[PDB]
Amino acid sequence: MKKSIKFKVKGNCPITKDVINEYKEYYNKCSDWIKNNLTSITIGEMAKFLQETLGKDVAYISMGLSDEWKDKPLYHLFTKKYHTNNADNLLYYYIKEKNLDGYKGNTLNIGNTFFRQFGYFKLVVSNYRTKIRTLNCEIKRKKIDADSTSEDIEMQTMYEIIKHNLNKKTDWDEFISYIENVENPNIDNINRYKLLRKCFCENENMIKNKLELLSIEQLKNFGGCIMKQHINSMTLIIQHFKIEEKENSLGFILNLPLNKKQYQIELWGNRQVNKGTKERDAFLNTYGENIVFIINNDELYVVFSYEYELEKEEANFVKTVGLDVNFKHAFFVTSEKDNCHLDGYINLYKYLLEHDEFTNLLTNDEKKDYEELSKVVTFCPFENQLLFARYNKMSKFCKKEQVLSKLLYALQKQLKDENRTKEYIYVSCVNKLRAKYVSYFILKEKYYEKQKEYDIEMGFVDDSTESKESMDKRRTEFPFRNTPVANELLSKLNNVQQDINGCLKNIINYIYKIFEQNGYKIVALENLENSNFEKKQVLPTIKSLLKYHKLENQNVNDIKASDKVKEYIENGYYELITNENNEIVDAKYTEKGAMKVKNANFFNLMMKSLHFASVKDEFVLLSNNGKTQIALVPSEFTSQMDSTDHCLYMKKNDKGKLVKADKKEVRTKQEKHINGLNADFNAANNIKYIVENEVWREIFCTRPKKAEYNVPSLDTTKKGPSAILHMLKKIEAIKILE
RNA sequence: CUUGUUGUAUAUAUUCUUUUAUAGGUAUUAAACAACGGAGAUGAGGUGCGCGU
DNA sequence: TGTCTATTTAGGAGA
DNA sequence: TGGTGCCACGCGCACCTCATCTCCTAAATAGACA
Ligand SMILES: [Mg+2]
Ligand SMILES: [Mg+2]
Ligand SMILES: [Mg+2]
Ligand SMILES: [Mg+2]
Ligand SMILES: [Mg+2]
């Protein structure tokens, strides 16, 4: 397979930001024409024009006037059945004969072949291929009543196939049995899905054809592929260029055709391609025609590609370990009791408990929970509530955060003194990660505050909704992103997130090398794909407490609102500024309510900024060269199933039916599972079981294929609670709860 | 050219920064450890703010 | 009369 | 479900994560300049 190496240009280069901007504008004009004619023009018309004017007996004109494509619209060139080069040539020479992109050359006089046809136009065509070949549909949900039109119900069945992935009839049968068979079902939700399931069977193929028709019909409203204003990149493909080792140096030289002559661009050396290594030999003998110019941080970089041989190892199944990912007490918990057998490993929870100062702050049960976690093999102590004590100064966890931080930094300095580099790097990165997330949160909140200030200041008066044109033009003419305030905040946020990513990579590398050193052949992980959880608790804001809640002119003495609104009013969250007649004119977030809003934002943003569903990607990248491999398992009911029986907990019903027990019934406390273990130790030991048992490995995990770059040795196709729950029942992996 | 990017110092000084404050900016001192397939686009989501309901 | 660099073209069913 | 601990509709303007796909070629000829 082909890899990449970046190089930094050492001197001055003709490639400036203006050249790249001109390239980008040419991209935009070409894509604008393509989007304006994606269905209006036919392939046969373009081919006929070329044959009549230029008059060539070439294959790209013969295939365009063939009967397969003579009548079809322009977007069929981007489908995977049409010949790639033939479609490129037909489109390019039609646009060129017509001058449809307004091309008048370029500033550096770069060879028009290497700049226009095989540069921006080639990227445009390759982008429009991705759009067409993965064409989707956009349907807005709607509640269907008992007496509703056929068109409304027909659309909603297509909607449910799009979102919930209901292809086969078994997909519907599992989904209904997942929704139905649970304590306290929602009758309204089941009625809609049953109606749509009935409709799906009667028009199943018509649904699959109307989906395609609607996708093609929506392509008219497509805005086209647009090269963003923040790109600062340019790709040229040149068949004949040269890369030579610079004599008496560790650098390289790029000989490039620039305005009918040869230009030389000097490149800094790269430790990925060193003089005595085999990677320099592979790079220098197998590089490709791809050349990238990118301006990152006001500096020019050059990218290339080259071939390489991958010797990634196969799975072994001799010693496996699971791993759950959490946020409340530990970042990573394995499925292995710590018994002073792993080498290079240090227990930070078994370090915290050795100090009397920390345990004295612990209540009797909390102390037992920490002593519970300290026997497992854990990593990177993250404390969601203790960390928020840094921002919320009037908190109840403040003294615990101070002691935790002090002990952690003392351990860091001690490890630095004793020359234990891997452990020292790990501890320092844990400290820095905890510190940097708070900075990220502060910067995000400031961004929100400044945006609100700017919007209220502008005072956008718009005539009507439902259309952008009716609204004030200033709302599009002067958006908040343009002002200088927004740019500094985003720069600071990007820097903080970069630090976070680096620290996380260091921690994961530590974990992987610990597992690799002792002879663990496979590491199993959850298949995490979403981390954008909804903000499940947002207090009714000032606008929403007076408009949607209709509390604007009600009575404080007699509040005609919801029970939850009564709960909120009873506590001091709000400041109702009533008038002389006890009519509310304004409402203000008090200190308690504002702090609650900040807390909700803090925990919601923690899921994303720490890249919850991307640590398996780091483990895969480390598994590309290492001896330990990676297995991805479905992340359903792993923190809801017994690790000592490998069974689910299902209770009876009022009708005597076995249904699914609530997730909060097998989980009394968030740290304990009813089986008498730690839930993270339970969840990680569930994860290991799929790999451990040959039966479950074949049932849930895909067959081991050839080793590939960024590919787990074991992966999963099934995605969804209904899919996993259905398979769990069929193998009798179920026990009856009390 | 003892050479690229990113992470790692609770390191020295600062009438620096609450818009990174157990951290950064600005200017120094030091050491190794590690990872590195790049570009663009499209799509699905979540979240912020304003105008309406 | 070379001597380098830009620039077309690349299939398919049909036979 | 997973992470926590359970949550309003339209129009827009912006920022983030995560998934997926394209693409990384070679020969032969035409032209620019002496
Ligand atoms: Mg988990
Ligand atoms: Mg940094
Ligand atoms: Mg867990
Ligand atoms: Mg660097
Ligand atoms: Mg470095």
Short mmCIF file of C-alpha atoms (C1' of nucleotides) in Angstrom, two decimals, chain A residues 2 4 8 10 127 131 136 163 226-228 249-250 266-267 269 271 390 409 412-413 416 424 428 432 436 446 448 451 455 462 498-499 506 509 513 532 535 543 608 709, chain B residues 1-11 17-24 32-53:
data_model
loop_
_atom_site.label_atom_id
_atom_site.label_comp_id
_atom_site.label_asym_id
_atom_site.label_seq_id
_atom_site.Cartn_x
_atom_site.Cartn_y
_atom_site.Cartn_z
CA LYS A 2 0.98 3.66 -0.38
CA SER A 4 2.86 9.56 2.86
CA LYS A 8 9.17 21.26 4.91
CA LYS A 10 13.72 25.33 3.50
CA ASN A 127 -15.18 14.74 -5.40
CA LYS A 131 -21.11 12.51 -3.90
CA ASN A 136 -28.34 9.53 0.20
CA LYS A 163 -32.20 6.26 10.09
CA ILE A 226 -17.25 23.76 -2.47
CA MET A 227 -13.60 24.20 -1.52
CA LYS A 228 -13.58 25.84 1.89
CA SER A 249 23.11 16.84 3.88
CA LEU A 250 20.20 14.91 5.36
CA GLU A 266 14.86 22.34 -1.15
CA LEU A 267 13.35 20.23 1.63
CA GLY A 269 15.30 16.19 6.24
CA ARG A 271 13.62 11.26 10.49
CA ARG A 390 -11.43 23.56 39.57
CA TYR A 409 2.20 15.67 40.87
CA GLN A 412 5.26 12.60 38.82
CA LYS A 413 8.32 14.26 40.37
CA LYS A 416 11.18 11.71 37.18
CA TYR A 424 6.81 9.47 34.17
CA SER A 428 2.67 13.84 33.36
CA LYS A 432 -1.79 17.74 31.63
CA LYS A 436 -6.20 21.15 29.62
CA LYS A 446 -16.24 32.51 26.62
CA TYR A 448 -20.59 31.45 23.67
CA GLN A 451 -21.23 35.46 20.45
CA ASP A 455 -25.78 38.99 18.31
CA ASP A 462 -36.07 40.29 9.86
CA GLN A 498 -3.95 19.72 20.02
CA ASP A 499 -2.38 19.40 23.48
CA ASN A 506 0.87 9.23 24.99
CA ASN A 509 0.85 4.21 23.79
CA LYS A 513 3.32 -1.16 25.37
CA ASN A 532 -22.43 13.27 20.33
CA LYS A 535 -27.62 17.32 26.40
CA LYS A 543 -36.68 32.83 26.51
CA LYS A 608 -16.50 15.04 22.68
CA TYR A 709 -3.61 -0.80 7.36
"C1'" C B 1 20.56 19.36 7.96
"C1'" U B 2 23.23 15.76 15.77
"C1'" U B 3 17.31 17.09 10.07
"C1'" G B 4 10.03 17.45 9.74
"C1'" U B 5 5.09 17.42 12.77
"C1'" U B 6 2.72 16.61 17.43
"C1'" G B 7 2.87 15.24 22.91
"C1'" U B 8 5.70 15.20 27.28
"C1'" A B 9 9.35 20.61 32.37
"C1'" U B 10 3.71 21.44 37.89
"C1'" A B 11 12.08 24.11 34.97
"C1'" U B 17 -2.97 36.93 30.32
"C1'" U B 18 -9.15 35.20 34.25
"C1'" U B 19 -10.15 35.33 26.36
"C1'" U B 20 -5.67 28.41 28.41
"C1'" A B 21 -4.14 30.74 35.77
"C1'" U B 22 -2.26 22.88 38.82
"C1'" A B 23 -2.17 26.66 32.31
"C1'" G B 24 -0.52 29.37 28.58
"C1'" A B 32 15.49 11.75 26.27
"C1'" C B 33 10.90 8.78 25.31
"C1'" A B 34 7.11 7.85 21.57
"C1'" A B 35 3.84 7.92 17.50
"C1'" C B 36 3.44 9.39 12.64
"C1'" G B 37 -1.01 8.15 5.28
"C1'" G B 38 -1.62 12.77 3.43
"C1'" A B 39 -5.20 15.82 0.74
"C1'" G B 40 -10.01 17.14 -0.48
"C1'" A B 41 -14.92 16.33 -0.45
"C1'" U B 42 -19.41 14.49 0.85
"C1'" G B 43 -22.93 12.56 4.54
"C1'" A B 44 -25.05 11.79 9.44
"C1'" G B 45 -25.24 13.89 14.09
"C1'" G B 46 -24.48 16.96 18.54
"C1'" U B 47 -23.91 21.81 20.48
"C1'" G B 48 -23.80 27.62 20.69
"C1'" C B 49 -26.38 32.36 19.29
"C1'" G B 50 -30.31 35.48 17.11
"C1'" C B 51 -35.46 36.04 15.04
"C1'" G B 52 -40.26 33.69 15.35
"C1'" U B 53 -43.92 30.24 17.86
#
